[model samples]
Target chain A: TGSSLPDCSYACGACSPCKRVMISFCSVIYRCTCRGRYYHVPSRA
Target chain B: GARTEPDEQDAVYDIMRATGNDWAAAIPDVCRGRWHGIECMPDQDNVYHVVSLSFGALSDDTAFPTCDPQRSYVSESLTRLKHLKALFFYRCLGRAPQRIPAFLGRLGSSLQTLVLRENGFLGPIPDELGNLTNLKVLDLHKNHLNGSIPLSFNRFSGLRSLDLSGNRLTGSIPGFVLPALSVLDLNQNLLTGPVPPTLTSCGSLIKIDLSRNRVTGPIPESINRLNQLVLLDLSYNRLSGPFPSSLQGLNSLQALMLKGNTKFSTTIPENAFKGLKNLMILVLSNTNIQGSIPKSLTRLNSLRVLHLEGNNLTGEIPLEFRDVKHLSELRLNDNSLTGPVPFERDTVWRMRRKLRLYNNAGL
Candidate 1:
């Protein structure tokens, strides 16, 4: 499933599905993924 | 769990690379948050600080050649995680550590234990460290940290063990009271000032080491009120005045080292040895004094090391000395005890410990 996008410019942490590690500091939820997932996966952006 | 096994291995491997072999940082990934040494808590969402990425060892004694002191060793990677509470980086190096990192602001609420023991870290311990309101144990021993303790240290209410021993720290020791602290080791530092009465407020301390400092003034009477102490070392300082006779309440005391006062006079009060039923080491070496060796000290069944050298103690050796059951090392040297050795001197011969009675012609 792909949507029309001009150029890939989304942040790595926000759109990656493989970013499985989620840490909640107070209320802000942060997620970190493997470098492969962060850099290789195509984002919705 | 086998399906996730490969991913776990990879995560753990990456964690090792990110941490540069810091065991505390490799913990959560090593056990997948189940448990791994000092790196994890009962809860799954926490991490420990086993490596100091900061520049230089925290103290002068520990120097690591690998780190570039200009670049701070802030954990840029772990700062994003909010659940980290315990950071034990004992004997780990923070070669390129920053003076203070902005990312640590995130841990201000959650961090409970942040230990950086035996690293040669330099400069003032950042004042912003007070932000960690939940801190329980802050072990930064044997570092090169200088200057006065930060005023922000007032925020450390939950702290149980705050060991800043063996540093190059200077200035008046802070007057803050930390009621929950149990072991406060500021020994072997360069702190100067009158020993404060306020320190008596950290009364819960069991092992307090302020030995080997330039601290002056009379040994405060307030220290006697801290009865929970087990080891009290106030040796090698310029403190003057009558040895506080008030220190008898420390019933749990095991070791009391007050050697090298350099200006003490007056006979050691026999009551000073009262209530110390468990005292093992009583070192009063090298203070100019005149008194007979107290026979009352024989009551200490645990007495092992008795150093009373360089004094002018007189009078015949008390016959009660034969009753000391556990006595090991006895140094009554450089004193003026006048009298013949009594009771065949077989009791001192029966013990296999060293008994130095040098420079004593009166004996």
Candidate 2:
């Protein structure tokens, strides 16, 4: 079995990150949390 | 690419190539009646394509004549049938052992089932077979095939059944992850290796036989994940290690054989097989397993055959074993048990005359 992660960790079509990025989530109004192939949006403004 | 329709001309060419001029004279008759061993299906254009081909008299007899002395009748012309789905090459008229034509790869995505059993085919299975992603069944048993199983076999994600038993294949069994694969028989070969955990990825497996080989290492614990498995045979190998506790989860298992492995040790776990209520056959003789027989085994009401001979099991045989209503054949010979025989009744003795409980000290 592979590692489990939150649903937001799945790849998002809205924000396509060009390169790899470490994920850091916050309560900011508009920010992208990039981790592996997934790009998480924290409350899209 | 669009599918090509195979006309009567291409069909004639393929038949002639496989059987030479003998079939050439019969082509007109074959195309008219849909023939005896070949079938055709119409394409979108209404052109008939030869979809299935079965070669020769389907036996190994010198009485049947062939056009080619080399006896490699699988010709390149077969590739012309772009929509061929099933092909059988059984026995090929008692021809010499020939290597499977590598051109079979040209059948590509169109081929779904291929049976080349008992044809005396020699040489290694071609790696080119990986291209047939659409293949579902592959039977190459009873051949003289040598060398390792192709690593490229991992690409058969759609395959449902595979039988390469009764061959001279060498090397380790590849870790297959085909979710659709349900039946795999590679017995009587020269294969060696530990059972790979990736095997659990094939969650649909119903039957697996890898007996009579040189495989080593412990049986994978991931096997517990295959709840759909009904039959498992890994007997007569070099496998060693304590029996995995996870086997208790195989609720659908009917038959389990792990006999003839000297290195396999450890006491049989009492609860290790409690869940296998559907189990009918359990053979674990000649192994190095110690400790008393698990009374939990009596829970399998469906058990018909139980062979636990040639082990180091001690203590009294479970008296509750009389509760196993379906028990017919029980061979607990050559053990260290000290007590009266488990079944001493006249009726029970009459019912199971095949029972061999001798060689146990007091029992």
Candidate 3:
């Protein structure tokens, strides 16, 4: 009910969810991006 | 459904924390195909990636997996594998003396089989690994490596089996132009110079082991252009001049080892074994090869192991090598030959001690 955010099953890889929000740099993140590929995640931050 | 794409699972846990106690990272889905020696594959967007990593103690009829004794070095995160293609580190890097990583030439565009055998790897082997160039089988055998092999290996040119054998490697042997090399094991190593007449321009050689190196000169009568050579071991080098009575054009030789160099005092070329028609093991033992014994080596009817022991030959003992009949072990022990022990009494009791004419003193 948080309107789509985490689908990549965390490092186990699956894809398809985050749809369109793009804002980051100062808070407004939410991604999965799929197809054109996007799931890099590797920062202890 | 096999995974691997989160910065390759964080570069495989920082390459399993630089290889210390990385018992397969306790398997938390490293492309999930039961991981062990690793070998993932997907990519086309299906992801997966890691193409073979084999690592340590890889031999003795196969059993790979033994690191964690404070494993010690080998992880610049292996440059993140870049879709690696076979990278074995057999017998695990014997507690570090390091140095073989020129960033593995950045995995030269998906490397093809690179083994660091008997790993105790030490100095110079890097011309940045001659930039791999799609290498095909590169084994750094019996390590403790030393310098001089890097003429940037003429950029491999489709390499095929190149083993930098039993190291301690020194200089001169480089003229490599590979041309699809076929098994060249620089045996024993402590290499000095000359064997290179452009290494017969490779012509797809088959087994040329520069045995117990300290290599001197003269034997490369242009190696008769390898005519597809088969097993030519230049034994115990310090080799002297003029012996190549033109290696009878190899005719696919079968084991022609020049045993114990001892400065070959010359004189074996009465047309040197006249065209070895597929010889089977012929070692001119303890050289200084004086004359006489050459009736084209009693016409090598496919000999089987004949080591001419301690030379300085004089005469008689070639009962036409008793009809060669696949001569089984014949070591004319300590020469200075004279006469009369020329086989006949049941060919000396069917070659009692494998036909060894002990210390010549007028036999």
Instruction: Please list the C-alpha lDDT of all candidates, in the order they appear.
Output: 0.64, 0.73, 0.73
Tens digit of lDDT per residue, candidate 2, span B1-363?
223243545665665566643434433333333333455555577555666766544322111222354544666777677877888776563346668877888878899999887777778899988878789999998999999999888888799999999999999988888999999999999999888888877889999899999999988877888989999999999999877876866878999999998889878888787767789999999997899988988887788899899999899989887666577788788999997765657526566556877788876
Highest TM-score against the true fold, candidate:
2
lDDT per residue, candidate 3, B1-363, as tens digits? 546776666676666556653544555666652323555677677777777766544432133444554456677777877877877887775355778889889879788889888867788888988898888889999988887888877887888998988899898888887888998999999989777777798889889998999989778776777888889888999989877757777788788888999987887877877778788999988987887687677787777788889989778876776566567788888998887765666656766798788888887
Model 1 chain B worst lDDT run, 10 consecutive residues? B33-42
DockQ of each model against the real complex? 0.02, 0.01, 0.02
lDDT string for model 1 (B1-363, tens) is 211133433433443344453332433333323211212222333423221222223332222212323332435555543555555554554455425344555667777777676655667787778888788888778887888888788788878988888888998777868888898888888999978777888878898788889888888877877888899888988778776766677888899887988876667778778767788999988877777887778787788999999887888778777666577788887888877655335656755448777678877
> Given the true complex, what DockQ would model 3 score?
0.02
Give every collision pair in model 3: B57-B91
Kindly report the docking quality category of candidate 1: incorrect
List interface RMSDs for the candidates, in order.
Answer: 17.1, 30.0, 14.8
Q: Each prediction's TM-score against the native?
A: 0.73, 0.82, 0.33
Measured with C-alpha atoms, the lDDT of residue B336 in candidate 3 is 86
fnat, candidate 1? Answer: 0.00
Worst 10 residues of 2 chain B by lDDT: B58-67
